[PDB]
Structure 1
């Protein structure tokens, strides 16, 4: 569960992401496909080359869901219900993959937030990404 200091931290860090969420989303995905090649088995339909439009478009959607999760941080199961359904019933990405993407998102933030990625914020973002993942797989079976 996210504490009051966790939410303050996520909101502060994500707030600083601002207009770059889409770009960061795309960069985390590239980091993931490059670092964890098995994750690419879920996008056989994507041209996965650096800067592809498919990956660029998908990163924006991923960052937009996260930006939504921060805005509804005290009500994530509901704010993420549609996405949760999508993942459980159609995509069916195996659960072990959310941790891989979550790690690449933290790495992407670290890389971009020299001042804000303090030990404390890093701890909170990890809990947050872990919580978004749990909601997204909560209806798997």
Structure 2
């Protein structure tokens, strides 16, 4: 479960992200695409190039969902319901991929937040991303 200290470390860390959210999202998507090439099978007709306008667009939609989840840490399932229905019924992305994206978001945050990415903080963030991933696949079957 996420605890009070988790929820505190997460809000403070995502809060520092702020308006760079969109930028961080696209880098996390690029770190993914490059370190784990099998994830590209889900974006067959995307322009996957460094600086692609399509990747920038999608990272912003991704960062924004995480913003809403942070702001509703106390009830992510209600918070992300249009989003879990869409992933379970249309997109249908395999569950192994959300671990790959989660890692890449932590690596992106570690590289941008020197002072805020302490040991206990890194630990709360890994726990919140796993929690977000479980909710997104909770209606799969």
**What SS is found at the alignment partner of 1:85?**
helix
User: Aligned partners of 2:97 and 2:140: how far apart in 1?
Assistant: 14
User: What is the CA-CA distance between 1:9 and the residue it aligns to?
Assistant: 0.3
User: Aligned partners of 1:47 and 1:83: how far apart in 2?
Assistant: 24
User: Aligned partners of 1:14 and 1:34: how far apart in 2?
Assistant: 24
Aligned length: 141
User: What is the CA-CA distance between 1:77 and the residue it aligns to?
Assistant: 0.3
Could you list the per-position Cα deviations for residues 74-93 of structure 1 after superposition, in whole angstroms to 9, with x for gaps in the alignment? 01000001100110000000
User: Aligned partners of 1:4 and 1:126: how far apart in 2?
Assistant: 15
User: Aligned partners of 2:17 and 2:70: how far apart in 1?
Assistant: 12
User: What is the CA-CA distance between 1:45 and the residue it aligns to?
Assistant: 1.2
What is the TM-score normalised by the length of structure 2? 0.99
User: What is the CA-CA distance between 1:13 and the residue it aligns to?
Assistant: 0.4
1:16 aligns to 2:16 (yes or no): yes
Match of 1:112 in 2: 112
User: Aligned partners of 1:85 and 1:105: how far apart in 2?
Assistant: 23
User: What is the CA-CA distance between 1:29 and the residue it aligns to?
Assistant: 0.2
User: What is the CA-CA distance between 1:60 and the residue it aligns to?
Assistant: 0.2
Could you list the per-position Cα deviations for residues 86-112 of structure 1 after superposition, in whole angstroms to 9, with x for gaps in the alignment? 100000000000000000000000000
What is the TM-score normalised by the length of structure 1? 0.99
User: Aligned partners of 1:24 and 1:66: how far apart in 2?
Assistant: 12
Note the residue ranges of structure 1 that are not aligned, 5 or more in a row: none
Give the alignment's Cα RMSD to 1 decimal: 0.4
User: Aligned partners of 2:70 and 2:101: how far apart in 1?
Assistant: 17
Structure 1 moving runs of 4+ over 6 Å = none
Note the residue ranges of structure 2 that are not aligned, 5 or more in a row: none
